[PDB]
Symmetry: C2
Subunit: 329 residues, 2 copies
């Protein structure tokens, strides 16, 4: 049996936050929302790992980039485009890029350009538009029993956290908001805000992780946001078999929500929010007329309900499974 195609999603790398904690004076060294050098490195290193897997180990892809062999599509953000470019600098590193004339590099250090397309800012494929995302949350998530129950558990801390941080804290949505800043701060080794104990920070961050993952424990929420991309990836698998496409890999450069919504759509929602450079791969194998699929998330195979002891299923089975999900929603 031979690996013949892979479709991949990544979360982007380490970034600055989007917002600030009112009562702190963090300086990030990069603009709000932008990928940091740490984030570029994380994606670059994932790219190196993917080269070891899909080039060295499986030989799905060649050592030197073949034009039109990989389709890369990113959401319309600097951080996801730069993450994809960084990853590709690991997948096809300096030294492997094309030569011209008599073995002279097309680009110094034999860099390999690989085209990245971006969706429009209003595309819902990879990143659901923010106001629409919040609307989905308000409608399906915020008033759900799990959300309400967790809210009551955490609510006794809101006044304190609010006075400490200066930011409004009147619900879990606000905790998630400031929680991101605390996550970035920790990732960059910043001190805690004055008066925020490590214990309090840990609680906020844990609620943030919980909140993000909880949203997609609903297959309906996952499908609303993620059904389009999930269908598309499965269609990519099919196009590798039906002769409609010659790509060896399709790669969607996205966000934590992108991973959460696809995993959630497939009925295997994540228990923890994806860390930086988390990634998912749908692998298609061929043994004669038999086609089998495996699903890999952060380095480990994932067992869909339809898969066997070996974390595998026929492509036909995956298709039927997806068809039923579609009919369900």
């Amino acid at each position: 049996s031979k690996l013949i195609f892979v479709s991949m999603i990544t979360r982007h790398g380490d970034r600055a936050p989007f917002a600030n904690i009112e009562n702190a004076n963090y300086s990030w060294g990069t603009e709000l929302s932008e990928l940091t050098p740490i984030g570029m490195n994380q994606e670059y290193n994932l790219g190196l790992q993917l080269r070891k897997r899909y080039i060295d180990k499986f030989g799905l892809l060649p050592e030197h980039y073949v034009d039109q062999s990989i389709y890369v599509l990113s959401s319309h953000t600097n951080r996801t485009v730069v993450s994809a470019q960084s990853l590709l600098m690991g997948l096809y590193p300096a030294g492997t890029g094309p030569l011209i004339g008599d073995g002279d590099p097309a680009i110094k250090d034999r860099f390999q350009p690989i085209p990245i397309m971006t969706l429009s800012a209003d595309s819902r494929l990879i990143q659901f538009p923010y106001e629409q995302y919040l609307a989905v949350l308000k409608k399906y998530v915020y008033n759900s029993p799990e959300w309400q129950n967790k809210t009551k558990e955490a609510a006794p801390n809101f006044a304190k956290w609010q006075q400490i941080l200066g930011n409004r804290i009147s619900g879990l949505n606000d905790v998630i908001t400031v929680g991101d800043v605390l996550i970035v701060a920790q990732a960059h080794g910043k001190p805690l805000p004055k008066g925020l104990s490590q214990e309090d920070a840990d609680q906020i961050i844990a609620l943030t992780d919980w909140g993000l993952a909880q949203q997609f424990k609903s297959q309906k929420v996952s499908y609303i946001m993620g059904g389009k991309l999930t269908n598309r990836m499965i269609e990519d698998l099919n196009n590798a078999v039906n002769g409609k496409s010659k790509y060896k890999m399709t790669y969607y450069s996205g966000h934590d929500l992108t991973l959460l919504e696809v995993m959630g759509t497939l009925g295997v929602p994540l228990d923890t929010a994806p860390g930086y450079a988390s990634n998912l791969e749908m692998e298609l194998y061929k043994d004669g007329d038999i086609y089998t699929v495996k699903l890999r998330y952060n380095g480990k195979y994932v067992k869909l309900p339809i898969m066997d002891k070996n974390n595998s299923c026929s492509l036909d089975a995956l298709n039927k499974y997806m068809q039923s999900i579609n009919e369900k929603f």
Copy 2:
């Protein structure tokens, strides 16, 4: 006076053709329509030149890339995206990328710089093909200049058609096969059997002529290029009015992109843009006074509104553009 902002358009680099000459067996080593290694190199070298100009000479941009300092937008094609990436590899080369104790974020200190792409149906940088041909049919193919040149060339159509195998029944078809001959020449391929160098030269010369001729019409130029021309001037204004902090906006495009903007501004090119051709709108500040210069392929261009020094005020450029708009 200090340079404070630049808006730039490029044509992409050397590429394979889009179609084949029927009676030839060329092998490009690159998929049809894709940028070649030669093309990556051309854009990379343009990037190096732009570093020497806008970083080293004018100091508009710093030696190490600053996030959100340059906005890059490409048409929805591999060749224009790869061209922009290659150029940026020259503008901010290996060795200048970020560190994470002085260890490179990416091996060889590569510098990623984000590139956004328009949708395939955007008309900003590349007019959609069918719509483009419709504009040509409507405004260009039946124009007197086009008809007259067609009559000059027509006595050769039968010969060229039998030689090449491709249909040749008008200048549009000459332009079509002409591109293949241009690529073949750029890659040192032999001539198709039975096509003399003289014939090849005529076809290529007609191709260059035809592409430029389309945009000698300011109306055609405006239909296709008015939107981008306005956007670039708006970029200049946003550098002054505080709305934008970009030092440069860069539109990665095609020969038509350059032709349509130049044609819109009333300075249509006489020659079709070669690979990695480029245009820059430069904005200068001397105190409260703002001046603009227009550079195409390394040389300043004199708009009708410009003075002896190939310069005009930004106010003048705005008024000039406003009139063009009102005109169309």
